[PDB]
């Protein structure tokens with residue numbers, strides 16, 4: 305299980321969803337970036353997975 309690297313856009317939360325063979329959600333992890341510049345972060349712990357997808361959400365007020 306090598307690290308997987310992700311670029312988190314400025315002022316955002318990146319949500320990574322791991323999926324299995326039947327398109328089922330295994331788990332989710334997330335990474336915040338409060339900075340005004342993009343930032344790379346690695347995920348080193350994760351379950352066995354078939355694929356992942358990512359989503360970006362804003363850290364602005366709700």
Ligand SMILES: [Cl-]
Pocket residue numbers: 311312313314342
């Ligand atoms: Cl970016």
Ligand SMILES: [Cl-]
Pocket residue numbers: 312336337343344345
């Ligand atoms: Cl970061």
Ligand SMILES: [Cl-]
Pocket residue numbers: 346347348349
């Ligand atoms: Cl991690």
